[PDB]
Design a protein around this nucleic acid. Structure first.
Ligand SMILES: [Mg+2]
Ligand SMILES: [Mg+2]
Ligand SMILES: [Mg+2]
Ligand SMILES: [Mg+2]
Ligand SMILES: [Mg+2]
Ligand SMILES: [Mg+2]
Ligand SMILES: [Mg+2]
Ligand SMILES: [Mg+2]
Ligand SMILES: [Mg+2]
Ligand SMILES: [Mg+2]
Ligand SMILES: [Mg+2]
Ligand SMILES: [Mg+2]
Ligand SMILES: [Mg+2]
Ligand SMILES: [Mg+2]
Ligand SMILES: [Mg+2]
Ligand SMILES: [Mg+2]
Ligand SMILES: [Mg+2]
Ligand SMILES: [Mg+2]
Ligand SMILES: [Mg+2]
Ligand SMILES: [Mg+2]
Ligand SMILES: [Mg+2]
Ligand SMILES: [Mg+2]
Ligand SMILES: [Mg+2]
Ligand SMILES: [Mg+2]
Ligand SMILES: [Mg+2]
Ligand SMILES: [Mg+2]
Ligand SMILES: [Mg+2]
Lengths: 145, 75, 64, 266
RNA sequence: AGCAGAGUGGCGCAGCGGAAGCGUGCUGGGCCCAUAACCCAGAGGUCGAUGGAUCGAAACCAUCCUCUGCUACCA
RNA sequence: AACGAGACUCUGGCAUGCUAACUAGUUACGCGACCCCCGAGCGGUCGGCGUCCCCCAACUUCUUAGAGGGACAAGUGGCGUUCAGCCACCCGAGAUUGAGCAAUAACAGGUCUGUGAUGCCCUUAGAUGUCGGGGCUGCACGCGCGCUACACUGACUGGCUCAGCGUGUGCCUACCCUACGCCGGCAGGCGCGGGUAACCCGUUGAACCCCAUUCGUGAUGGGGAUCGGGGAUUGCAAUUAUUCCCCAUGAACGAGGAAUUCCCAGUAAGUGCGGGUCAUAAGCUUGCGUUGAUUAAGUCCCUGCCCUUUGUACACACCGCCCG
RNA sequence: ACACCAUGG
């Protein structure tokens, strides 16, 4: 039924219209399953459609709700950047601002040279896990001279 | 693994072949219909429920993990 | 090289043969003329009275 | 597809198989000088002397040349052996294997351009063309490769039956990258030691007369490996024609330095 | 200078166009109370360099370079 | 004649026989009440559902726990020098539950870091007898016990329906198990009660399993490592994230080389629940239930053990001795 | 009708 164009190019990422919407839009970063289901419910569109069955007047509404969530009554405890450390905002950072925020957070930490930044610099484990018997990336060392 | 490129929904050729197989198959299950054509297997369930609605196939068993139909309780 | 199959009935259990005690010496008659008897080594849990199938009945078992 | 006129292997033939894996009773193997049917080499049937570990004399993923001991064409069983494999048989088996792979790989442009939707195209092409390409000199000792050996050196056979489209200019190109060049070795042994000053322009009356009764300018080899042993080779032809033109060369070139002064080796 | 042979894993080598392995060495496991022997896996490749043919090469052709044996031994 | 084995103690299986129970129940109807006709009928009388309420009702079947009983190779047939005993079968709750305890002789086994057990040596005020801070967790690598997975005999989302062994307010020591109302998406907060316990949490609404949805062979909605941002609680103090919750990032892994461990029936394995440590907290261990197989009824091959005969140049005992 | 099986702070 209705073999129409399926491959979508949503902002800076490729979606396949061969999948269901609630699991197709998770291909974008910052959008998981629990977030995408809510973004699709608030937009009043159906949830049994393949992602190719959406004409150009649904996708636009879906993304404008996906990017301005607090406008459409998506709560605060549910967003992936809350009390933004340097601006006090609440937001979902979605596609490319995610990598920029992550690198900005790592660089902020390394700047004041806190301990987390020093573990991020030396490529070690940042939480409090033992590193004596895990990680194990290098090569075997020979004991016979 | 491998690459099974199945169809997410029918086209007219597969759509007529799906109605031209009804008298042929003694056992009808979603997996058999998936293997005959190139169907995403979750579309085969909808196709068989549609065929059942039109009286074209007869349900012999339905369970959570298995469904079975047969051709018009004949032959 | 061409021989038919022979069904044989077990009439006595002798002992357990093989390195691990893994097979059994058994005496059988031939289901056609009871006046015949041979000794075979059987692999499974054989009782007395069972019927074995012989793919090669011109052989006989020595041991092991 | 199938590499051989015979669909299935026959008893007492050396098939060049690919060991695909090993079970508790035997190495199951992919036969590939035939279709890709499964076969088994039995672990008892694998050596005559004691084996220290099996992961040496078999390794999964190596092609090797093993004989057939039983085939059941009824339900598709092949049993194979490595006890029953001769080094002299080892000489000829991968010869046959590579000569069959050559005809399988020449039958690719066909599948490259023809109805490659199915692979029955290549099966049909095989049973049509390659079935008859070897039944003419098989017992004399030639496979399906002799037809194509002749196709560019003497094209009369491919046109002696059906000739198809866009297959000629592929085979008459590529087999003459590999099989055609002549085994040239016939460096003539011209040994002389003269005591005259015109001894260089006295043989020059024959220096151009390597091959006689031909054109003056036809290309020959100008050689010098030692002042006492001059050397000659002429128009290449084929190496028995090469020996026919060369047979008197050592003598017809010498018959000019003997006449002036001094007696040489004949 | 010439002939012949060779150039592929640290080292010896196999590899008759559908294309990277063997034997040894190296490192770590196994087996044993322990060491050697023996078993396993891992690491390490401009297939001498440069062009060309071929649908395609380490392999065929051409030029050059580098080793080894043997004569030439050459103002 | 003595010890060890056996006997012995706890435990699991059976008693419609005994003893006797609102801190356990059943049945009956006294009942009374709710509800539906769901049956004859009217809807009432008769019935059907009730962890709804009562009995100074009758009783002990289910629950509890005491006393006795009961199994002995006793009966029957074979094999046994007709002895000791073995196999099969009837009857039966059962014809071979599981643990505790355990000898002479010994080991240069472990423990001086359990001890107001302890000899000798050392130190003893610039202490090797107390407070603050850091470590025991650091990471090229080698190894051991384990948890979660590699998905369709599955994951997800709903619905349905069943346990047993336990623990519970602390003396110095200050903290226990929780019902039910409200507030919050969640972790959690506030307010009022019960329990020193067959009395309250609790009829312990456990998980796997069962019944329906969505997915569809694609490292995918399998897997959940690593990492960013935010919110709670314990505490004197959480950074080297104590633990918990929420949105996001989404690695290896497609059944595992040479080797090697454990296991015979309510057992292996799957599955959850308690106790121990515990201001905070289990991928550990120690117990409990729940679903519940395949394979054996053997042998001495491999690794060892026991008894006899035999050989020895060993006795620090073959991991010995010993020749050039 | 018998493959290999060396040595010991
Ligand atoms: Mg006595
Ligand atoms: Mg008796
Ligand atoms: Mg009975
Ligand atoms: Mg007992
Ligand atoms: Mg003892
Ligand atoms: Mg002590
Ligand atoms: Mg002391
Ligand atoms: Mg201690
Ligand atoms: Mg003190
Ligand atoms: Mg301190
Ligand atoms: Mg420690
Ligand atoms: Mg341990
Ligand atoms: Mg599990
Ligand atoms: Mg536990
Ligand atoms: Mg507690
Ligand atoms: Mg605990
Ligand atoms: Mg512990
Ligand atoms: Mg063992
Ligand atoms: Mg004994
Ligand atoms: Mg003695
Ligand atoms: Mg002595
Ligand atoms: Mg010794
Ligand atoms: Mg000595
Ligand atoms: Mg030894
Ligand atoms: Mg020595
Ligand atoms: Mg010595
Ligand atoms: Mg010694």
């Amino acid at each position: 039924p209705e073999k129409f164009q399926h491959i979508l190019r949503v902002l800076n990422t490729n979606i396949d219209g061969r999948r269901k919407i609630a699991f197709a839009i998770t291909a974008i970063k910052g959008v998981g399953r629990r977030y995408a289901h809510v973004v699709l419910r608030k937009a009043d569109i159906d949830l049994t459609k393949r992602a190719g069955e959406l004409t150009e007047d649904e996708v636009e509404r879906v993304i404008t709700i996906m990017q301005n969530p607090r406008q459409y009554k998506i709560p605060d405890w549910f967003l992936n950047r809350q009390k933004d450390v340097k601006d006090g905002k609440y937001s979902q950072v979605l596609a490319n601002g995610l990598d920029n925020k992550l690198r900005e957070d790592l660089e902020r930490l390394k700047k004041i040279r806190a301990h987390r930044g020093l573990r991020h610099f030396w490529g070690l484990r940042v939480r409090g896990q033992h590193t004596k018997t895990t990680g194990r990336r290098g090569r075997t060392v020979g004991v016979s001279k | 693994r491998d690459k099974l490129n199945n169809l997410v929904l029918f086209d007219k050729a597969t759509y007529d072949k799906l109605c031209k197989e009804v008298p042929n198959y003694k056992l009808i299950t979603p997996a058999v219909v998936s293997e005959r054509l190139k169907i995403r297997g979750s579309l085969a369930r909808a196709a068989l429920q549609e065929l059942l609605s039109k009286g074209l196939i007869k349900l012999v068993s339905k369970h959570r993990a298995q469904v079975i139909y047969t051709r018009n309780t004949k032959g | 090289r061409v021989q038919p199959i022979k069904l044989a009935r077990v009439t006595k259990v002798l002992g357990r043969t093989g390195s691990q005690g893994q097979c059994t010496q058994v005496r059988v008659e031939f289901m056609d003329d009871t006046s015949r008897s041979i000794i075979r080594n059987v692999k499974g849990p054989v009782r007395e009275g069972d019927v074995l199938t012989l793919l090669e009945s011109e052989r006989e078992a020595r041991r092991l | 597809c199938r590499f051989y006129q015979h669909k299935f292997p026959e008893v007492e033939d050396v098939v060049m198989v690919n060991v695909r894996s090993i079970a508790e009773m035997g190495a199951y193997v992919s036969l590939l000088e035939y279709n890709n049917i499964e076969g088994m080499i039995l672990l008892s049937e694998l050596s005559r002397r004691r084996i220290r570990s099996i992961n040496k004399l078999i390794r999964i993923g190596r092609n090797e040349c093993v004989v057939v001991i039983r085939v059941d064409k009824e339900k598709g069983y092949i049993d194979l052996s490595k006890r029953r494999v001769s080094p002299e048989e080892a000489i000829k088996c991968e010869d046959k294997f590579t000569k069959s792979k050559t005809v399988y790989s020449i039958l690719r442009h066909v599948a490259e351009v023809l109805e490659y939707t199915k692979d029955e195209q290549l099966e049909s092409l095989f049973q049509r063309t390659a079935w008859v390409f070897d039944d003419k000199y098989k017992r004399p000792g030639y496979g399906a490769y002799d037809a194509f050996k002749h196709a560019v050196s003497d094209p009369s056979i491919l046109d002696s039956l059906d000739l198809n489209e866009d297959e000629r200019e592929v085979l008459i190109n590529n087999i003459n990258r590999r099989l055609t060049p002549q085994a040239v070795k016939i460096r003539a042994d011209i040994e002389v030691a003269c005591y005259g000053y015109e001894g260089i322009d006295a043989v020059k009356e024959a220096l151009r007369a390597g091959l006689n009764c031909s054109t003056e300018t036809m290309p020959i080899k100008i050689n010098l490996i030692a002042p006492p042993r001059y050397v000659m080779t002429t128009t290449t032809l084929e190496r028995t024609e090469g020996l026919s033109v060369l047979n008197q060369a050592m003598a017809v070139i010498k018959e000019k330095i003997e006449e002036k002064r001094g007696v040489f080796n004949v």
